Amino acid sequence: TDELLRLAKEQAELLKEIKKLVEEIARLVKEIQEDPSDELLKTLAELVRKLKELVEDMERSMKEQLYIIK
Amino acid sequence: TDELLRLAKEQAELLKEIKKLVEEIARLVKEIQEDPSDELLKTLAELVRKLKELVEDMERSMKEQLYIIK
């Protein structure tokens, strides 16, 4: 109810962060194609880990919302 | 009958797909760190473009859910 709204806004903020992060990753991959250094690849690995966390967070929020709806 | 349920189920399968792709990207990055070849980096760039599209696919539904719930 008020929870469904809270969860929806939580998901929207996560989606915003995810979209932004995926765009960042795309640009970094282009840089790495120019210079595949260890440091840039370490950074990319870190961004992908962060991305997985955000996706997990959004999935958990959506599942909780599903539970409440059901 | 329940549109909030329909959409929530229609965001859950997208994220499940996104989660899979993200985990694939993570493993690929690890391989690129071992062999940063042009071919593997071209593949990574393709996977990230596909990821962008899936994230965008979540946008309309997210906005609908928000509109419906508010």
Side-chain angles (χ1 to χ4, degrees):
Chain A
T1 88
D2 290 323
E3 288 177 16
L4 293 181
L5 174 69
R6 180 187 70 82
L7 291 167
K9 282 180 171 297
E10 186 185 51
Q11 295 159 16
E13 181 65 23
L14 282 167
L15 186 60
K16 188 176 187 294
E17 293 168 18
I18 288 170
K19 179 177 182 175
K20 180 174 180 175
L21 179 51
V22 170
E23 288 165 346
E24 181 180 37
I25 286 168
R27 291 186 172 102
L28 183 59
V29 169
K30 296 184 179 298
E31 281 177 39
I32 289 171
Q33 283 173 302
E34 305 273 13
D35 192 344
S37 64
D38 295 349
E39 176 64 24
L40 290 189
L41 284 168
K42 177 179 187 292
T43 303
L44 176 60
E46 196 276 350
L47 294 186
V48 173
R49 274 191 293 280
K50 180 64 180 181
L51 176 59
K52 184 178 181 179
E53 296 179 16
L54 293 178
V55 168
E56 291 285 359
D57 288 349
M58 198 178 182
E59 189 175 49
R60 294 173 185 170
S61 174
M62 293 183 334
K63 276 172 163 55
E64 181 182 341
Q65 197 185 43
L66 267 174
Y67 183 86
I68 297 168
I69 290 173
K70 285 172 173 288
Chain B
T1 305
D2 190 341
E3 279 310 301
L4 203 57
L5 177 68
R6 187 179 173 98
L7 294 173
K9 282 180 175 295
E10 276 187 13
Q11 285 288 65
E13 80 317 338
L14 259 185
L15 254 202
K16 183 183 184 179
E17 178 178 1
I18 288 173
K19 183 178 180 179
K20 269 193 52 185
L21 182 53
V22 165
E23 286 167 348
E24 183 183 43
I25 282 170
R27 290 186 172 98
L28 178 54
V29 169
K30 294 168 237 226
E31 180 168 6
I32 288 171
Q33 288 177 300
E34 301 265 16
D35 188 346
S37 69
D38 295 347
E39 172 63 23
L40 287 186
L41 280 169
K42 179 170 71 66
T43 301
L44 177 63
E46 195 276 355
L47 292 182
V48 171
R49 277 190 292 279
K50 172 66 176 182
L51 179 55
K52 285 177 137 168
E53 300 174 353
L54 294 185
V55 170
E56 282 288 350
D57 287 346
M58 296 197 67
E59 290 288 352
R60 178 105 156 187
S61 176
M62 181 76 265
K63 298 174 182 179
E64 285 188 322
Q65 289 175 280
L66 216 52
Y67 186 82
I68 287 167
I69 294 175
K70 281 175 177 289

